[PDB]
Design a protein around this ligand. Structure first.
Ligand SMILES: CCCCCCCCCCCC[N+](C)(C)[O-]
Length: 421
């Protein structure tokens, strides 16, 4: 799922996020579907956090006989969540919440070899939704939400061995047979591994809305169709490139050189839209079943091109992602007043068209398996605890002169606190 994450609740995690938009057993879900609010008698609160601990790795060798082995580049994270749904009147009621739909954090060492294309890339995301719902007849329920999306990103690449490859390349030719090519090559074979090759950094707020639909057969069965729009973040950050201002103009496909001087960069982060369709079926007094099919247009994520005050290009990477689907199915078992339990499986096809593959966004079809429990205290309180094992598919990624190979697994763990009036 590119750099998109759906950890909005701990009860959600427990069921590998299925039926979401059709399950309102906690305020956690109104975030997915605005229409879910029309399902709450009383004011409900809930806030928790998801503990993400990935295990991605890179392996490989550089033409410079160097090691491209990038061990565990994915850092543990904490994605917390806060929700609040509350009735206004029998046909109307609003809600609010703080969630994070997107995120990314891959980091190698400044002395990595494939460091040209792998060094440090982070993305902090925080969606603030304020949705309102309107019931209609005994089955339909429309919902709408507004979103302010704060982001903090900081890209940073360094020169790995390219200077050495760059050098050899020159000398390996006629150029090398000249005090200049010999000089032009000496300059190149000098570049230490940790020479900041590019630094983009800036934070901004983005805006988007999201509508919802709810149609039910009765208090036990329903289906949903939701829509979360695209979000075009226009940053205004800082650009720094320690490469002398001489490497400039030869058109070497190298990120503009400032000379270590911080210039004023511009970037546009495109957060893909999401459509989703899920259903919920309680077939017994204890059993229930939910499933969903999501489609995210990663088509909208084409590149990341930086640009100066006067409009000239500094940094630029082609993503050319494409759309993709997520699929999920799970069950909820209502034991007694107290105990509740969940399980689930899911599968999402990566949007990265194998070829545009990149070691900074080591993505690979992911597989979810989750289990969780809930324990209500008295019809007004209840704590959530969820866990999920995620695994991917080893891919081959040819970038720059280099060729890598990344495999990755991740284990999840959330716990939310519920309260009502
Ligand atoms: C001046 C803005 C500087 C921030 C640059 C934006 C970085 C967004 C990171 C998310 C995309 C991840 N990727 C493809 C670059 O690895």
């Amino acid at each position: 799922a590119g750099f998109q994450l759906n950890e909005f609740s701990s009860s959600g995690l427990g069921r590998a996020y299925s039926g979401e938009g059709a399950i309102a057993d906690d305020a956690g879900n109104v975030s997915r579907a605005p229409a879910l609010i029309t399902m709450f008698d009383r004011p409900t609160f809930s806030a928790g956090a998801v503990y993400i601990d990935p295990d991605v790795n890179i392996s490989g060798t550089s033409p410079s006989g160097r090691s491209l082995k990038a061990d565990n580049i994915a850092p543990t994270a904490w994605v917390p969540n806060m929700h609040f749904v509350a009735p206004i009147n029998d046909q109307f009621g609003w809600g609010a919440s703080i969630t994070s739909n997107y995120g990314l954090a891959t980091e190698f060492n400044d002395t990595y070899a494939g460091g040209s294309v792998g060094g440090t890339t982070d993305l902090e995301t925080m969606n603030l939704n304020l949705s309102g719902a309107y019931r209609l007849n005994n089955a339909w329920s429309f919902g709408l939400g507004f979103n302010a999306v704060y982001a903090r990103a900081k890209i940073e690449r360094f020169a790995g061995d390219l200077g050495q490859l760059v050098a050899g390349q020159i000398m390996q030719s006629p150029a090398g047979q000249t005090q200049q090519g010999q000089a032009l090559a000496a300059t190149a074979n000098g570049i230490d591994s940790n020479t900041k090759t590019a630094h983009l950094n800036g934070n901004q707020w983005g805006f988007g809305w999201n509508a919802g639909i709810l149609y039910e057969l009765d208090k036990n069965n329903r289906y949903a169709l939701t829509y979360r729009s695209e979000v075009k973040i226009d940053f205004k950050g800082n650009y720094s490139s320690d490469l002398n201002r001489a490497f400039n103009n030869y058109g070497l496909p190298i990120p503009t050189a400032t000379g270590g001087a911080t210039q004023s960069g511009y970037l546009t982060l495109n957060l893909p839209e999401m459509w989703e369709v899920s259903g919920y079926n309680r077939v017994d007094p204890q059993w229930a079943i939910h499933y969903s099919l999501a489609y995210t247009s990663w088509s909208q994520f084409q590149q990341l091109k930086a640009t100066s005050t006067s409009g000239d290009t500094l940094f630029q990477k082609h993503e050319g992602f494409k759309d993709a689907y997520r699929i999920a199915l799970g069950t909820t078992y209502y034991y007694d007043d107290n105990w509740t339990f969940r399980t689930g499986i899911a599968f999402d096809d990566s949007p990265v068209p194998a070829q545009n593959r990149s070691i900074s966004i080591p993505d690979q079809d992911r597989f979810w398996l989750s289990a969780g429990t809930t324990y209500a205290f008295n019809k007004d309180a209840s704590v959530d605890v969820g866990v999920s094992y995620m695994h991917g598919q080893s891919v081959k990624i040819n970038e720059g002169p280099y060729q890598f190979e990344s495999e990755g697994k991740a284990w999840l763990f959330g716990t939310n606190f519920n309260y009502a009036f």
